[PDB]
């Protein structure tokens, strides 16, 4: 059912977000899944292509958000897709931005708990709010094949 699928998509997304965030946090481990290998490559490609802008955005974000970065990230994700359209490129940017955000929070002395909250925010949004789009596009296996 829709609830069963959403729960599964949320967990699949959480694993993916947790892996990318860890990858951005100095941890070196083999990708746990083909989708993780793909996201590591694609999200770092997007960062390398816009590194200064992502860095500036992450610092502005954290300086204007305050107490709850996860809540602020939900509002950004909502505005990113605020034109009703959804595609894998926008998903990649969410991962790229959150990876830079996580790295900046670590640089500022924060614990890994904040990282986990950001991963759960991505998972809840894509696996819950965007479950229909994710399913119709084949989920993270479709993400893999779309980018060959």
């Amino acid at each position: 059912g829709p609830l069963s699928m959403s729960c599964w998509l949320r967990e699949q997304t959480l694993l993916l977000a947790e892996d990318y965030i860890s990858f951005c946090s100095g941890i070196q481990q083999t990708p746990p899944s083909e989708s993780a290998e793909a996201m590591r490559y694609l999200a770092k490609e997007m960062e390398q292509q816009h590194r200064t802008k992502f860095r500036s955005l992450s610092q502005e974000f954290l300086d204007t958000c305050g107490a709850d970065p996860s809540k602020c990230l939900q509002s950004v994700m909502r505005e990113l897709v605020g034109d009703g359209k959804m595609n894998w490129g926008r998903v990649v940017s969410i991962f790229t931005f959150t990876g830079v955000l996580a790295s900046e929070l670590l640089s500022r002395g924060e614990n890994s708990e904040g990282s986990r909250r950001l991963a759960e925010t991505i998972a809840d949004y894509l696996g819950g709010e965007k479950q229909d789009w994710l399913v119709e596009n084949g989920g993270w296996e479709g993400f893999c094949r779309f980018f060959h």
């Binding site: 816009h50 502005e60 994700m77 505005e79």
Partner: peptide, 22 residues
């Protein structure tokens, strides 16, 4: 124009460029 919309639009434009190269 407020922060969340500013950041969302910035990410949108970078996503569009990523699609142009893919």
């Amino acid at each position: 124009l407020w922060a969340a919309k500013k950041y969302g639009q910035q990410l949108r434009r970078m996503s569009d460029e990523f699609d142009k190269g893919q």
